[PDB]
Amino acid sequence: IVEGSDAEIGMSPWQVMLFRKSPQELLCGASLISDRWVLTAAHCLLYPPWDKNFTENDLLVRIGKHSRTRYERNIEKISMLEKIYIHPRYNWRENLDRDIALMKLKKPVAFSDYIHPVCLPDRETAASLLQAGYKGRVTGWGNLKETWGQPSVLQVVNLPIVERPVCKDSTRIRITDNMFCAGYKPDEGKRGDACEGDSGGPFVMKSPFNNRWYQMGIVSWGEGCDRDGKPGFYTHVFRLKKWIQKVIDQFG
Amino acid sequence: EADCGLRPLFEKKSLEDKTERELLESYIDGR
Ligand SMILES: [K+]
């Protein structure tokens, strides 16, 4: 996260860290959507251009965390994975279309002050909130700048959804209806973005109707970190909700 | 799933975090 700020304790209790077991390496963000299910980006797990293909035994998640490196006793929870599910039409060859994966925990996680699931959007919430100019919140422990510099506390930034034609014009990559983009205009004075390592984490919005937080997006891809006129791209969670449900309903 | 998206230390306590108003403002305009 660039130009974010430190999260308050318990501010994002669905935040999940995805780690490589050996060597210990923070890979990606993720989010808790039930006591057994974690949502992330497909490219965090499977990316053939980098000869990346993690199985359940390669990985672990950390839930309830605030500090990046510090062990938080009786609060953070480490879970192993029973199974990984990648969207069967995830497109790594071209444009990261359908950049979504589900991970089933080996054992359900106990909810607490610091561990609590986010909602998935229904059609009315999607209709209400996913509009150009409306802001969501992105969180993560990823880099603070371009990869070629790490926060100690979970970072938070609020970013406006960008009009689809402007998203399209920002990139030569073919965008799809399974993505949306978010970020400020050049010379707005305001800035902010997700960076390397924030991938797979949640873009959330709070409904004025029922006061619940909903995960509308997954940090997916972007041309640079906080570069002028380069908004971040997010997996459109509502558009892929039928797949999410089929997996949980079938394998839950 | 029934209790989703309501944070123990915020919504459940009728407390607001420091920047959530910025989101509400964007959905309506200003204030
Ligand atoms: K409005």
Curated annotation (Swiss-Prot), chain A:
Residues of the Peptidase S1 domain: 1-249
Effect of E146A: In FA2D; Salakta/Frankfurt
Enzyme active site: H43, D99, S199
Region feature High affinity receptor-binding region which is also known as the TP508 peptide, mapped onto this chain: 182-204
Effect of R62C: In FA2D; Quick-1
Effect of P23T: Confirmed at protein level
Documented effect of changing R98W: In FA2D; Tokushima
Residues of this chain annotated as glycosylated in UniProt: N53
Outcome (variant: M17T): In FA2D; Himi-1
Record's protein name: Thrombin heavy chain
Source species: Homo sapiens (Human)
UniProtKB/Swiss-Prot annotation, chain B:
Transmembrane residue ranges: none
Protein name per the record: Thrombin light chain
Lineage, broadest ranks: Eukaryota, Metazoa, Chordata, Craniata, Vertebrata
Gene symbol of the encoding locus: F2
Residues of the full protein shown: 333 to 363 of 622
